[PDB]
Amino acid sequence: ADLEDNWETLNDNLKVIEKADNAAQVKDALTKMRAAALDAQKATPPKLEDKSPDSPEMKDFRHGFDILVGQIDDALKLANEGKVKEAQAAAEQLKTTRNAYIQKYLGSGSCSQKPSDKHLDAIPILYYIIFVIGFLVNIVVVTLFCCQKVSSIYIFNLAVADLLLLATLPLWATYYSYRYDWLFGPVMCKVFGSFLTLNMFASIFFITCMSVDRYQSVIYPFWQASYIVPLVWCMACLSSLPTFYFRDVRTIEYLGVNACIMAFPPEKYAQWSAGIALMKNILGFIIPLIFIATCYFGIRKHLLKTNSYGKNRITRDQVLKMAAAVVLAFIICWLPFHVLTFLDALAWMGVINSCEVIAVIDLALPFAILLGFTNSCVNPFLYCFVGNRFQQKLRSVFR
Amino acid sequence: ADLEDNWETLNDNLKVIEKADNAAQVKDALTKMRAAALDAQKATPPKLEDKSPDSPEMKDFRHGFDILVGQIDDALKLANEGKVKEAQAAAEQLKTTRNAHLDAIPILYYIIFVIGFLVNIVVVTLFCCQKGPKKVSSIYIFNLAVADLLLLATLPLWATYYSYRYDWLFGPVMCKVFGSFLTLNMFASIFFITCMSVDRYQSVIYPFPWQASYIVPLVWCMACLSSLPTFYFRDVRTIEYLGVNACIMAFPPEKYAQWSAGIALMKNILGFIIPLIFIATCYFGIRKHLLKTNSYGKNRITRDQVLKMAAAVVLAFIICWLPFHVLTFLDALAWMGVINSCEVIAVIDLALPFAILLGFTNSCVNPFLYCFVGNRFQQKLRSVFR
Ligand SMILES: CCc1nc2ccc(N(Cc3ccccc3)C(=O)c3cccs3)cc2c(=O)n1Cc1ccc(-c2ccccc2-c2nn[nH]n2)cc1
Numbered sequence: 065a066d067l068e069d070n071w072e073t074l075n076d077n078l079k080v081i082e083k084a085d086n087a088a089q090v091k092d093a094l095t096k097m098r099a100a101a102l103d104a105q106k107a108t109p110p111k112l113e114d115k116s117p118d119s120p121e122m123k124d125f126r127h128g129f130d131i132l133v134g135q136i137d138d139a140l141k142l143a144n145e146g147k148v149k150e151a152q153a154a155a156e157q158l159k160t161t162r163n164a165y166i167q168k169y170l171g172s173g174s175c176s177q178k179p180s181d182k183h184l185d186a187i188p189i190l191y192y193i194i195f196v197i198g199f200l201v202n203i204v205v206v207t208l209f210c211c212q213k214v215s216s217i218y219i220f221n222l223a224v225a226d227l228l229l230l231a232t233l234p235l236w237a238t239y240y241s242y243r244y245d246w247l248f249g250p251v252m253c254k255v256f257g258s259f260l261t262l263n264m265f266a267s268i269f270f271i272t273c274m275s276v277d278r279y280q281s282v283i284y285p286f287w288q289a290s291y292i293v294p295l296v297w298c299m300a301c302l303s304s305l306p307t308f309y310f311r312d313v314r315t316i317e318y319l320g321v322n323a324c325i326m327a328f329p330p331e332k333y334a335q336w337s338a339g340i341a342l343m344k345n346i347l348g349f350i351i352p353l354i355f356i357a358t359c360y361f362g363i364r365k366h367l368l369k370t371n372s373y374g375k376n377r378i379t380r381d382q383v384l385k386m387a388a389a390v391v392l393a394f395i396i397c398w399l400p401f402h403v404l405t406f407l408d409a410l411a412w413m414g415v416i417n418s419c420e421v422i423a424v425i426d427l428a429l430p431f432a433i434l435l436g437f438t439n440s441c442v443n444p445f446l447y448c449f450v451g452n453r454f455q456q457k458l459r460s461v462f463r
Numbered sequence: 464a465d466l467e468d469n470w471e472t473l474n475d476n477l478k479v480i481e482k483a484d485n486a487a488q489v490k491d492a493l494t495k496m497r498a499a500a501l502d503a504q505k506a507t508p509p510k511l512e513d514k515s516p517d518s519p520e521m522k523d524f525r526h527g528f529d530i531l532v533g534q535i536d537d538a539l540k541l542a543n544e545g546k547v548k549e550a551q552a553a554a555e556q557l558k559t560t561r562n563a564h565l566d567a568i569p570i571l572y573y574i575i576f577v578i579g580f581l582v583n584i585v586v587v588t589l590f591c592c593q594k595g596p597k598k599v600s601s602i603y604i605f606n607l608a609v610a611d612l613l614l615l616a617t618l619p620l621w622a623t624y625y626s627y628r629y630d631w632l633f634g635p636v637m638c639k640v641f642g643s644f645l646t647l648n649m650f651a652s653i654f655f656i657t658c659m660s661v662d663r664y665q666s667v668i669y670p671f672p673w674q675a676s677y678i679v680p681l682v683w684c685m686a687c688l689s690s691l692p693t694f695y696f697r698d699v700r701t702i703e704y705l706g707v708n709a710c711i712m713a714f715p716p717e718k719y720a721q722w723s724a725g726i727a728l729m730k731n732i733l734g735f736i737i738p739l740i741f742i743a744t745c746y747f748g749i750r751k752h753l754l755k756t757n758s759y760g761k762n763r764i765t766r767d768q769v770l771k772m773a774a775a776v777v778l779a780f781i782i783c784w785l786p787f788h789v790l791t792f793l794d795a796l797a798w799m800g801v802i803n804s805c806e807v808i809a810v811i812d813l814a815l816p817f818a819i820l821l822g823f824t825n826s827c828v829n830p831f832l833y834c835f836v837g838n839r840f841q842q843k844l845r846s847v848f849r
Pocket residue numbers: 236237239240253256257260261264303304306307311324326340343344348430433434436437
């Protein structure tokens with residue numbers, strides 16, 4: 065009798081029609097669907113719950129099922145006439161009506177405000193400011209090898225991953241400016257969508273390599289790079305496959321705009337939205353932060369286990385300052401984004417059903433995304449512009 | 464006691480050191496290797512069998528094992544001190560020790576230079592004074608022609624460098640500059656070839672302005688970043704056994720075999736594997752959309768000619784670049800210690816200057832394959848769409 069369970073009854077029986085052999089299978093499935101459609105029409109969605117029945121958005125909700133039951137009756141007509149392929153063709157029009165629901169009541173469509181209502185002129189400006197500043201500081205990192213170590217190889221790969229990540233900012237600023245109207249074709253929606261995720265993870269995984277490398281340099285003062293570097297680009301490539309698979313241009317009917325969305329299976333759209341959001345947290349923040357934090361306290365342990373003289377005290381704390389800066393910068397730049405992503409996942413799970421909260425997440429998200437790119441501006445100062453001085457202060461305490 | 468069986472004993476124990484947990488495993492393996500190295504030093508190879516022991520090539524053979532036993536003793540020193548990762552690092556230098564002119568080539572290089580330069584001259588000059596800066600696909604054509612033109616412009620250098628039996632007479636600064644200029648325009652060519660296949664595919668699957676202002680700089684940016692490890696490692700170094708100053712890939716000598724194997728894999732993945740994935744997927748992507756549309760009359764002749772133009776861009780790229788990357792992958796396996804037979808290593812050396820020429824020959828194919836024959840692809844794609 066629940067709305068979510070009735071859509072499951074509608075989508076499971078819609079699959080039966082596609083793989084049906086005889087007209088009796090189609091008729092049976094459509095009879096179950098007509099019952100579920102009328103039962104779902106009586107239900108009230110979790111979003112716009114405390115809403116009057118005479119309201120236009122509640123009258124539109126029940127109207128959607130009048131269209132749906134009408135399409136079911138046209139397919140039932142054909143099934144009873146013994147017209148299987150005709151009924152299966154008529155039943156395929158139910159998907160168009162089902163998609164008009166998932167982009168309205170299932171999501172923050174008929175909940176949170178439209179992009180036109182939440183458009184700030186500062187966002188495209190801020191995105192170009194971080195683009196030119198971040199692009200020029202990573203140009204220094206790369207050209208610094210020309211005018212002048214296994215660790216240096218990870219620096220270059222980090223600078224390349226950062227420099228290609230920041231190179232996508234002119235696209236998102238343009239896409240935001242045209243109120244989410246993708247004017248580059250659906251092919252570049254998959255390609256640059258994947259290219260973004262590829263270099264984002266390549267940045268985060270090479271940050272993780274640096275902490276493991278600096279830790280292994282502290283605990284053990286004393287071919288690995290020629291296999292770890294291709295492997296880091298391999299894992300970033302595999303982590304960016306769900307982006308290539310689901311990113312696609314789809315027309316948002318109530319906005320009349322072609323948006324580069326995450327075109328998930330409509331029959332399990334909330335499940336996928338919640339699932340992929342958890343993948344972002346675990347794979348992009350939780351797991352790399354476990355490594356970065358463990359390597360910090362791992363280094364912090366060994367420096368409090370060597371010597372405590374006054375001359376070697378200054379040298380010890382400056383190594384710890386460089387060590388605490390790589391963990392704090394990663395948290396400040398990526399924690400706001402993953403907090404909003406975890407809250408977003410709870411909204412798809414049905415935990416958060418407040419449009420006030422969901423609206424906060426929507427307007428905060430373009431800013432939280434910018435801090436993620438801002439981490440690529442910080443990396444030159446954390447690793448390249450310190451690596452030359454971190455090495456001599458680590459050899460001083462070791463002697 | 465056989466030389467082949469002693470090298471098998473040396474290679475099997477190297478696999479033990481890599482996967483060793485404790486210093487005793489490393490010490491045990493190196494003790495078996497020191498025995499196998501001294502036993503192999505006493506053996507005479509099948510080649511240069513009927514050769515005097517006082518001969519320089521016989522003294523060099525036994526000298527190679529004196530270097531090999533030396534590195535084993537340096538590793539045994541660390542293993543006995545309880546330095547596992549240090550001993551495993553020292554034992555990896557044993558691989559470097561284990562791995563240890565045609566007049567037609569400079570002529571052929573100048574033939575491809577003048578033919579390729581003149582075919583890209585007709586394309587560059589066409590776009591400016593006899594056409595215009597309109598259309599999006601035409602912008603990639605011009606950038607491809609510029610990248611090809613500048614790539615073919617380096618052929619007089621490699622022909623001269625080959626003529627002086629690899630004696631770089633231009634200074635170590637131009638070894639880094641033209642070395643990177645070569646790689647820059649090589650990747651700029653391959654990446655704009657990749658753009659063309661993605662553009663033609665997007666024109667087929669979606670028959671219905673901004674994208675060009677962003678992609679052209681992004682492609683040249685990725686070309687500059689791909690040619691940086693070239694600028695950092697290419698340098699002039701004296702090759703003692705040839706007595707010549709060669710413009711080589713000056714990797715750290717203590718870590719030369721790992722770097723040579725690593726950068727060879729970079730060439731295959733970034734310069735052939737990844738771009739070929741795009742070119743092949745866009746071909747079968749186009750091939751899919753045309754075959755699902757039922758053609759049978761005049762439209763069938765129109766459909767197959769579009770497929771002929773489509774199959775020509777993937778086949779030309781494979782014919783011109785696959786020989787080079789096959790030899791590069793085999794070269795990488797030789798540095799990894801996979802390929803031990805010097806006969807196939809000698810084949811790579813003489814087959815490499817020819818395989819490099821086919822790479823430049825792809826820049827002779829691109830003007831015909833996209834600007835000239837590719838102009839009909841525009842008219843014949845709108846005919847099947849209508
Ligand atoms: C800082 C890096 C970053 N830049 C972005 C730039 C733009 C946008 N936006 C929204 C936007 C548009 C214009 C201005 C401002 C915002 C988009 O619409 C598009 C994204 C990809 C193609 S279009 C989102 C992001 C954005 O979420 N991130 C972070 C991030 C987190 C997680 C994943 C991820 C991990 C695992 C599996 C799948 C994904 C996954 N998420 N979205 N696609 N793929 C990818 C990226």
